[PDB]
Design a protein around this ligand. Structure first.
Ligand SMILES: [N+]
Ligand SMILES: [N+]
Ligand SMILES: [Y+3]
Ligand SMILES: [Y+3]
Ligand SMILES: [Y+3]
Length: 160
C-alpha cells in the first residue's frame, strides 16, 4: 500500500457560515443517542469547538482553559466531532456532540475533503450569538496551527 500523506493545508468541503447571518440549523447526536438540536439553544450563546477527534487521553491546558473561559462568559460549549458518542466521554455547560449521522460537517463547511483525515471535521471554532447569528468563525488553515482563542473569546464576550 502507498501512504495517503497529510498535507499542511486544510481543505474542507465548503465554506464556514458567514458572520452576521443566522447559524445553520443542526441536529447532532448526544451521549444518550438522543438529538442535540440547535433549537435547544435558542437565546443562548454557543461555542462550537470542532475537532477531527476528541478521542485522546490528552487535554491540552489550552483547550480546557478556553472551554472554561467560554463557559464562564455564559456560553454553552459543544465539542463537536465525528467520533461516536461512546468515544466522546473520554475528552476533557460543556458537552460533547457527535456528527456521525447528521449533516453538520457539510452544513458548516468543515468536513475534511481529502487526505488521511477525509470525512472527519477540521479543527475550527464557530461562535453563535445569543441572537442566533454567527458571531465569529475560524477554520484553522494548517494542520499544526493552534486556534486563535483570544479572538473567539472577544467575539463570545460581545454576544453573551
Ligand atoms: N474510545
Ligand atoms: N488529493
Ligand atoms: Y468564499
Ligand atoms: Y425544532
Ligand atoms: Y504556513
Amino acid at each position: 500500500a502507498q501512504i495517503t500523506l497529510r498535507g499542511n493545508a486544510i481543505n474542507t468541503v465548503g465554506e464556514l457560515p458567514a458572520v452576521g447571518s443566522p447559524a445553520p440549523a443542526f441536529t447532532l447526536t448526544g451521549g444518550d443517542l438522543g438529538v442535540i438540536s440547535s433549537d435547544q439553544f435558542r437565546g443562548k450563546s454557543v461555542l462550537l469547538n470542532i475537532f477531527p477527534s476528541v478521542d485522546t487521553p490528552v487535554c491540552a491546558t489550552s483547550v480546557r482553559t478556553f472551554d472554561e473561559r467560554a463557559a464562564a462568559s455564559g456560553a454553552t460549549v459543544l465539542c463537536v466531532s465525528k467520533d461516536l458518542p461512546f468515544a466522546q466521554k473520554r475528552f476533557c455547560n460543556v458537552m460533547p456532540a457527535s456528527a456521525f449521522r447528521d449533516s453538520f460537517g457539510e452544513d458548516y463547511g468543515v468536513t475534511i475533503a481529502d487526505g488521511p483525515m477525509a470525512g472527519l471535521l477540521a479543527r475550527a471554532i464557530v461562535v453563535i450569538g445569543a441572537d442566533g447569528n454567527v458571531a465569529y468563525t475560524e477554520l484553522v488553515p494548517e494542520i499544526a496551527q493552534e486556534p486563535n482563542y483570544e479572538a473567539a473569546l472577544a467575539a463570545l464576550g460581545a454576544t453573551s
